[PDB]
């Protein structure tokens, strides 16, 4: 069985969903953690300096 098209047909699982805290469709309903703002993981908001160029 190929890894391409054949294996795409099996994809009907719901993981990432609208996040109650930031509104992005990044709340992983199985992990219960927003990969965007980190809701459900961090009381603080998910930030990272690499999300931008070093001198900016």
């Amino acid at each position: 069985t190929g890894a391409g098209t054949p294996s795409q047909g099996k994809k009907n699982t719901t993981t990432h969903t609208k996040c109650r805290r930031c509104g992005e469709k990044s709340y992983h309903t199985k992990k219960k953690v927003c990969s965007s703002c980190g809701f459900g993981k961090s009381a603080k908001r998910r930030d990272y300096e690499w999300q931008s160029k070093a001198g900016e």
């Binding site: 719901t14 969903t17 609208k18 469709k25």
Partner: protein, 46 residues
Amino acid sequence: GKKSKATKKRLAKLDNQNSRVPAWVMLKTDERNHKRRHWRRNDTDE
């Protein structure tokens, strides 16, 4: 699938949001819904 009351409100909004730009707004602005969506061609969140 099964939808929660909230998921329904959202889908509901996305449905109303999917409308024509009122005929009159085109006159008032002396001559497009850039967010127009299709159930098949597009994909909503969730």
